[model samples]
Target: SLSSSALIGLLVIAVAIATVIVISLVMLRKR
Candidate 1:
């Protein structure tokens, strides 16, 4: 079983990665 803190950490990292990907795509489109 996963601890709540660990689950939250994973979620944060996933969101950070997703945001970076989105920003990168938008920058590419603007070029």
Candidate 2:
């Protein structure tokens, strides 16, 4: 069975990736 810690890890990774992408896009637009 899946565990809570594992689920939280997945969510944190997803959010990290999304945040990086958003920051890169914003930087590109500024240039």
Candidate 3:
């Protein structure tokens, strides 16, 4: 069963990964 903590962890991880990817892409484009 999925608990509240588990859902929050998953959401946070997903957002972190997406933010990282976006930052990397912008950094590369600036070079």
Candidate 4:
């Protein structure tokens, strides 16, 4: 049973994860 709020929350989490991965890769290249 999934709700609209749950779907939005999942999307937010996915974006956060993608942001973290991009930041990490950029940092790795700088060092």
Best by TM-score: 4
Per-residue CA lDDT of model 3 for 7-28, tens digit only, reads: 8777888888888986898888
Q: Distance from true position, residue 31, model 4, in Å? A: 9.5
Whole-model lDDT, candidate 3? 0.81
What value of lDDT does candidate 1 attain over all alpha carbons? 0.82
What stretches of model 3 exceed 4 Å from their correct place? Answer: 1-5, 26-31
The sequence of per-residue lDDT tens digits that candidate 1 reaches over residues 1-31 is 6457668777888889888986998898899
lDDT of 4 by residue, 1-31 (tens): 5456668777888888888986898888899
CA lDDT for candidate 2: 0.82
Worst 10 residues of 1 by lDDT: 1-10
* Deviating ranges (above 4 Å) for candidate 2: 1-5, 26-31
Query: Mind giving the per-residue lDDT tens digits that candidate 2 earns over 1-31?
Result: 6556668777888889888986998888899
TM-score of candidate 3 to 2 decimals: 0.45
Cα miss at 23, model 4 (Å)? 2.2
Misplaced by over 4 Å in model 4 are 1-5, 26-31
Distance from true location, Cα of 24 in model 2, Å? 2.4
Give the TM-scores of the predictions, in the order they appear: 0.46, 0.46, 0.45, 0.48
* Whole-model lDDT per candidate: 0.82, 0.82, 0.81, 0.80
